[PDB]
Ligand binder design. Sequence first.
Ligand SMILES: [Zn+2]
Ligand SMILES: [Zn+2]
Ligand SMILES: [Zn+2]
Lengths: 85, 87, 87
Amino acid sequence: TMEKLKEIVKHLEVAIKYLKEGKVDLADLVVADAIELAKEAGDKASLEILKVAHKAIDTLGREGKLEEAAKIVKYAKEYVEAKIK
Amino acid sequence: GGTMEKLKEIVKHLEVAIKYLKEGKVDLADLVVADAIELAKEAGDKASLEILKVAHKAIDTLGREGKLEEAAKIVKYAKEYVEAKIK
Amino acid sequence: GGTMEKLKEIVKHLEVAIKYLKEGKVDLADLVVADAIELAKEAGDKASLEILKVAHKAIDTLGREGKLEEAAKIVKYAKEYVEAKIK
Ligand SMILES: [Zn+2]
Ligand SMILES: [Zn+2]
Ligand SMILES: [Zn+2]
């Protein structure tokens, strides 16, 4: 599916936007929503990366880094964009 | 699947989604509609799930463009349909 | 069900929920509890899933009506049950 892998990228840009101002919880919820949308597509190589990004938020952004978790979210978004093209 | 037991929580979620959509909050309303969709996948039903998915895509398209009125209208229509499905 | 690193995620989400409920934000606490439920249904624990659903419904019903202390108590009991399950 190509029309449901562009909503994931649209949420992954809000996630980074929140992560750049300390909104770790809202970014967590956005990534959870993206995982929920990715569970509905036929892709089983981008859902795992989204789960990795969510766990990255949990174990890397709540401790005050906020620079590396954003990087993991950017890597996930770039992987999804590479996949849709 | 739901007789104003698990189908009335969706209405209380949609109301807060509409309230969020009013002032400026597209993202919180989107998250609320996603929660309502997650609730609707458990309480059986097929029409409510589709209408809530339509409302979610409506949030995504209309709300972030700047047309909050259209997104509020679509979520209101979905809430009214869900309310008329529990009667 | 999914033991550590799957249930501690739920515990941390419940801690965030309790933090939010003490300030007055019922909608964000609702969303994070829904996220914690979504983390369940994957670990394999069913009692934990049922208690998370109980906590979600409790947060809605009793905290949207201004009784935040009792909703915080219910979420604390849910978190204590999940912690007692990982040990
Ligand atoms: Zn989460
Ligand atoms: Zn969404
Ligand atoms: Zn909820």
